[PDB]
């Protein structure tokens, strides 16, 4: 069916919208910018004498293009067939690649959303989500990017994270206040993230091995993902997806670049609440994989050894988890989850190691208060 | 009773243009040496500007079904509608294909069409399709038909782009009808008999002198005259002449006594012409009118005219023969005969006369394919390197 | 710390405005390297 549909669509190029004609067309990115402008312009948006009575033309154009790129991405051939090397499949994929350029998709993903806010009184003001640019629109762009181009280059992965992913994650994190969480925009954005972005990053986990240079970038991603994980309005499936993605990424990330996320983990784990479940799994996996980096003085030959501040933080982490387990009443699941973590961190900590009496200063917990988490 | 297009037949791809509301006939061409990109040469203006059919001619190597082509890729037949055909550029030897690169001439989707050395891959092959319902798929393609070509690799049509002021041939989703015109069929070509488009030397007299331009005097202006010269020049590219018939269709047909044509100096690229002052001067392509540059071959000095004879479609009858035949050059409009002024490294000036000397008979010598290719390469190289030098001078 | 100073000014702006959560109110560590460069240049020049 996909082969027939793609052939018919390219046979009749008038079905691609004015932008993707190729006949003096401004391109997908410029078309969606024009659609944005239509969305802010009331005169050209409304009929200008309900949904049936008032249709937003900018949102309609946006949805049309989103549907078109979604359909083309779905029509794109499968990876197993393309690995088998079918000529018809590679032909179809090349035709789709010609149809949509990469820069246009990058620009559409880079385009940001309007942020609903609280008013002067404090009640949230919500722009009409049926009007304007919506996360489902970018969902199709991400689908096409994954199925047609595919993320197989670390440089392109980090460039996409620079331009369109990390800002979205940070906005979702910033919209985690109790009033702003309930907004339908937050629900839509969480849906988009947990259904399109995080699975893509999970499937692109090995590429994250070479992230030495963009340490700040990878740390920002980790912190944003962790903040989303502590966000409350998430559904169970959304939380599961976030946990899987974060564990997968931290699995192949290089050990010393855990340290920044570990610094945030250590003071939030001793609560041993329900939110503390997945930090425990992350810690267990990290310490089990990297115990050599901690135990042996040499550690991994390429990686080296700890900076000893990570060692002090890990020690206080171990002690906090131990005392919290001692105080907390026995819960079967919680205690079967914490036990491997406690044992793994104890094993990773060198028994011959001596704690330094010199404490650490500039405790970030003072700036990281309960409200807004900062 | 109607000829059918088969393999090993020289063909040209004609198309129609409606520029400023006039019908213009153009042909898909490409100069294989240097720029591989294809362009279009105007053929409807044969009255004023000679068409460079030498780079327009194409030969059909194979015509196989899409199924057979796919099987082969996994590993004198007649063109039937629905096959994929392999075009080879006659002069250069490369094959027409979608270059998969684009000039971005107001069409992102369009792919440039050029020439490729290797026939492997799906880029070279072009599936052939009927233009209209009059001949369904599978039917034999007649010589006079309109055909649409779909690229195997890119699934686009050979399309004429009007977006820019200059017309471009590109692979596009919009389809343009192409007509295949048979230049010649080498299968039935008679050896030793002159055919149109052949590169030949006009030997003259018993001294075996040849109609050659002056030597490499470092001046294209000085290289515009013509004179008879004999000796080592006979084995040089300075004396090669291409006989281009005034007809586009069936141009490679055997030359008949009295056929009008133009003589093109291969090395200098100029066409032989007659001034009103009864002196021959080589002019450029733009100023090569039919009246100025048209010449005919006559068997004898007798002035009887055959009148107007119909041009026959097909290979034709072989009349003029190399070496054995004796020909006389007659200017079409002025009716004069080419002759030698005899005023004398012999450097005998060649003039035009309404009686001429008794010994105006000439012999025709074919040029080897390697020599012809080398002469064309020399011309196309000197042109580019002169443009380069002038640009550096500016 | 000077990002904290800037964020205190911008937070006072946020309460005065009554809304408009600024995208860069996230901690300096959470910020991108490109955004952190504005304070990194001053850090480098003063210490060097």
DSSP 8-state symbol, B33 = S
Length of chain C: 48
Minimal C-alpha gap between A290 and chain C (Å)? 24
Quote the CA–CA distance of B261 and C34 in Å, as a whole number.
72
C–B contact (≥3 CB pairs within 8 Å)? Answer: no
Q: What is the DSSP string of B97-129?
A: EE-S----SS-SS-EEEEEES---SSSS-EEEE
Q: Does C15 contact A at CB distance below 8 Å? A: no
Question: Residue B111's closest chain A neighbor by CA?
Answer: A98
A–C contact (≥3 CB pairs within 8 Å)? Answer: yes
Distance linking the first and last C-alpha atoms of chain A: 52
Tell me the β-bridge partners of B10.
B59, B184
Tokens 């309404």, located at residue: B354
Quote the CA–CA distance of A124 and A187 in Å, as a whole number.
15
Q: Contact, B46 vs B92, CB < 8 A?
A: no
Q: Contact, B40 vs B27, CB < 8 A?
A: yes
- CA triplet B23, B29, B32: central angle to 5 degrees? 165
With residue B200 as reference, give the H or E element that holds it.
strand B199-204
Which two tokens mark A227? 């903040």
Tell me the β-bridge partners of B37.
B114
Distance linking the first and last C-alpha atoms of chain B: 60
Smallest CA-to-CA distance from B94 within B11, B39, B37, B41 is with B37
Q: What is the DSSP string of B282-318?
A: -B-STT--HHHH-EEEESSS--------PPPSSS---
- CA triplet B129, B130, B135: central angle to 5 degrees? 135
Q: Does A190 contact C at CB distance below 8 Å? A: no
Quote the CA–CA distance of B214 and B226 in Å, as a whole number.
7
Quote the CA–CA distance of A28 and B93 in Å, as a whole number.
41
Q: Contact, A307 vs A360, CB < 8 A?
A: no
Alpha helices in chain B (DSSP H): 53-56, 66-74, 290-293, 369-393
Which two tokens mark C38? 């504005």
- CA distances (Å), A168 to each of A138, C23, C31, in order? 11, 10, 13
Give resolution in angstroms: 3.5
Q: Report helix angle A166-174 to A215-230, nearest 10.
A: 40
- Phi and psi based region of residue B65 (left: phi greater than 0; alpha: psi -120 to 50; beta: remaining): beta
Q: How many CA atoms lie less than 13 Å away from A116 in the CB half-sphere?
A: 26
Q: Contact, B152 vs B65, CB < 8 A?
A: no
Check C33 against A166: CB less than 8 A apart.
no
Q: Contact, B207 vs B196, CB < 8 A?
A: no
Q: Contact, B290 vs B266, CB < 8 A?
A: no
Minimal C-alpha gap between A57 and chain B (Å)? 26
With residue C44 as reference, give the H or E element that holds it.
helix C33-47
Residues of B in contact with A11 (CB under 8 A): 173
Residues of A in contact with C33 (CB under 8 A): 214, 216-217
Quote the CA–CA distance of B97 and B381 in Å, as a whole number.
24
* β-pairing verdict for B126-130 and B111-116: unpaired
Q: Contact, B258 vs B297, CB < 8 A?
A: yes
Tokens 């020439």, located at residue: B115
Q: Computed over its alpha carbons, how large is the radius of gyration of chain C? A: 12
Which two tokens mark B158? 């050979």
Q: Contact, A35 vs A64, CB < 8 A?
A: no
Alpha helices in chain A (DSSP H): 2-11, 27-40, 42-45, 57-75, 79-84, 87-99, 102-110, 135-144, 154-160, 166-174, 178-181, 184-192, 198-203, 215-230, 236-252, 259-268, 277-295, 309-327, 332-348
Minimal C-alpha gap between C48 and chain A (Å)? 22
Residues of C in contact with A166 (CB under 8 A): 32
Residues of A in contact with B108 (CB under 8 A): 22, 25, 27, 98, 101
Smallest CA-to-CA distance from A268 within A214, A312, A230, A307 is with A230
B282 phi, psi to nearest 5 deg: -80, 120
- Residues with Cβ within 8 Å of residue A246, at least 6 apart in sequence: A222, A225, A226, A229, A278, A282
Quote the CA–CA distance of B261 and B122 in Å, as a whole number.
40
Quote the CA–CA distance of A205 and B366 in Å, as a whole number.
70
Tokens 């550690």, located at residue: A299
10 Å CB burial of residue A86 (0-12, 13-18, 19+) is: middle
Quote the CA–CA distance of A260 and A247 in Å, as a whole number.
15
Give residues 88 to 147 of A whose Cβ lies within 8 Å of C. Answer: 115, 117-122, 125
Check C32 against A216: CB less than 8 A apart.
yes
Smallest CA-to-CA distance from B323 within B357, B362, B371 is with B362
Q: Contact, C1 vs C8, CB < 8 A?
A: no
Which two tokens mark A345? 């961190």
Q: Does B162 contact A at CB distance below 8 Å? A: no
The CA-based dihedral angle spanning residues B307, B308, B314, B315, taken in that order and rounded to the nearest 10 degrees: 30
Tell me the β-bridge partners of B245.
B261
Check C30 against A125: CB less than 8 A apart.
no
Check C19 against A224: CB less than 8 A apart.
no
Alpha helices in A231-276 (DSSP H): 236-252, 259-268
- Residues with Cβ within 8 Å of residue A313, at least 6 apart in sequence: A259, A262, A263, A266, A360
Minimal C-alpha gap between B71 and chain A (Å)? 11
Q: What is the DSSP string of A21-37?
A: GSSS--HHHHHHHHHHH
Smallest CA-to-CA distance from A334 within A269, A244, A286, A267 is with A269
Smallest CA-to-CA distance from A190 within A203, A175, A178 is with A175
Q: Contact, A19 vs A27, CB < 8 A?
A: yes
- CA distances (Å), B389 to each of A343, B285, B392, B394, in order? 81, 22, 5, 9
Q: What is the DSSP string of A41-93?
A: -HHHHS----TTT---HHHHHHHHHHHHHHHHHHHSPPHHHHHHT-HHHHHHH
Q: Contact, B38 vs B30, CB < 8 A?
A: yes
Distance linking the first and last C-alpha atoms of chain C: 18
């Amino acid at each position: 069916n996909a082969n027939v549909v793609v052939r018919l669509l390219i046979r009749r190029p008038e079905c691609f919208g004015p932008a993707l004609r190729g006949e003096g067309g401004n391109g997908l990115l410029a078309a969606m910018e024009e659609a944005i402008k239509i969305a802010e312009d009331p005169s050209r948006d409304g009929p200008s004498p309900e949904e049936d009575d008032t249709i937003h033309m900018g949102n309609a154009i946006m949805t049309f293009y989103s549907a078109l790129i979604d359909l083309l991405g779905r029509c794109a051939p499968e990876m197993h067939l393309i690995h088998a090397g079918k000529g018809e499949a590679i032909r179809i994929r090349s035709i789709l690649r010609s149809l949509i350029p990469l820069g246009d998709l990058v620009g559409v993903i880079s385009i940001a959303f309007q942020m609903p806010t609280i008013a002067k009184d404090g009640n949230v003001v919500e722009p009409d989500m049926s009007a304007g640019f919506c996360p489902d629109h970018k969902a199709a762009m991400v689908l096409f990017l994954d199925r047609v181009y595919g993320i197989e280059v670390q440089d392109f992965l980090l460039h996409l994270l620079e331009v369109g992913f990390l800002p979205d994650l940070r906005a979702a994190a910033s919209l985690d206040t109790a009033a702003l969480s309930a907004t339908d925009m937050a629900l839509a954005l969480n849906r988009y993230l947990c259904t399109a972005v995080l699975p893509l990053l999970t499937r692109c986990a090995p590429l994250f091995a070479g992230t030495e240079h963009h340490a700040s970038l990878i740390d920002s991603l980790l912190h944003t993902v962790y903040r989303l994980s502590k966000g409350c309005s998430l559904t169970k499936a959304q939380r599961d997806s976030i946990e899987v993605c974060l564990l997968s990424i931290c699995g192949q990330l290089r050990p010393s670049m855990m340290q920044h996320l570990l610094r945030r983990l250590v003071f939030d784990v001793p609560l041993l609440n329900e939110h503390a479940k997945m930090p425990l799994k992350l810690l267990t996996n990290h310490y089990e994989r990297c115990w050599k980096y901690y135990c042996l003085p040499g550690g991994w030959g390429n990686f080296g050894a700890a900076s000893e501040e990570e060692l002090h933080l890990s020690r206080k982490l171990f002690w906090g988890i131990f005392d919290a387990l001692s105080q907390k009443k026995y819960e079967q699941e919680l205690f079967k989850l914490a036990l491997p973590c406690l044992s793994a961190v104890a094993g990773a900590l060198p028994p011959d190691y001596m704690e330094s009496n010199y404490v650490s200063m500039m405790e970030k917990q003072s700036s990281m208060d309960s409200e807004g988490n900062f | 009773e109607i000829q059918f297009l088969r393999t090993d037949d020289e063909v040209v791809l004609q198309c129609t243009a409606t520029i400023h509301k006039e019908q213009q006939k153009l042909c898909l061409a490409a100069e294989g040496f240097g720029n591989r990109l294809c362009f279009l040469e105007s053929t409807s203006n044969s009255k004023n500007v000679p068409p460079d059919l030498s780079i327009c001619t194409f030969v059909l190597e194979q015509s196989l079904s899409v199924r057979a082509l796919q099987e082969m890729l996994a590993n004198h037949r007649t063109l039937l509608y629905g096959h994929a055909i392999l075009l080879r550029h006659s002069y250069s030897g490369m094959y027409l294909c979608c270059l998969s690169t684009s000039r971005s001439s107001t069409d992102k989707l369009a792919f440039d069409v050029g020439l490729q050395e290797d026939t492997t891959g799906e880029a070279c092959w072009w599936t052939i399709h009927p233009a209209s319902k009059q001949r369904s798929e599978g039917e034999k393609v007649r010589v006079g038909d309109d055909l649409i070509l779909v690229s195997v690799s890119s699934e686009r049509y050979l399309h004429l782009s009007y977006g820019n002021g200059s017309l471009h041939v590109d692979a596009a989703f919009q389809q343009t009808l192409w007509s295949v015109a048979p230049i010649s069929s080498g299968s039935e070509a008679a050896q030793g008999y002159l055919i149109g488009g052949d590169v030949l030397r006009l030997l003259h007299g018993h001294m075996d002198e040849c109609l050659t331009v002056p030597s490499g005097e470092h001046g294209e202006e000085q290289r515009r005259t013509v004179h008879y010269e004999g000796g080592a020049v006979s084995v040089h590219a300075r004396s090669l002449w291409r006989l281009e018939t005034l007809r586009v269709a069936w141009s490679g047909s055997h030359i008949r006594w009295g056929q009008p044509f133009r003589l093109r100096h291969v090395t200098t690229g100029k066409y032989l012409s007659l001034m009103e002052d009864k002196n021959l001067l080589l002019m450029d392509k733009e100023k090569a009118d039919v009246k100025s540059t048209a010449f005919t071959f006559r068997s004898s000095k007798e002035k009887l005219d055959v009148g107007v004879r119909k041009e026959v479609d097909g290979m034709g009858t072989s009349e003029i023969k190399y070496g054995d035949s004796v020909c006389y050059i007659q200017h079409v409009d002025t009716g004069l005969w080419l002759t030698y002024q005899s005023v004398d490294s012999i450097q005998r000036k060649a003039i035009m006369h309404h009686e001429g000397h008794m010994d105006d008979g000439i012999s025709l010598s074919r040029s080897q394919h390697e020599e012809s290719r080398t002469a064309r390469v020399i011309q196309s190289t000197v042109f580019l390197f002169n443009r380069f030098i002038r640009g550096l001078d500016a | 710390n000077y990002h904290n100073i800037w964020a205190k000014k911008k937070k006072m702006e946020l309460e005065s405005k009554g809304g408009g959560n600024h995208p860069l109110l996230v901690p300096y560590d959470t910020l991108t390297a490109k955004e952190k460069a504005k304070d990194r240049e001053k850090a480098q020049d003063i210490l060097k």
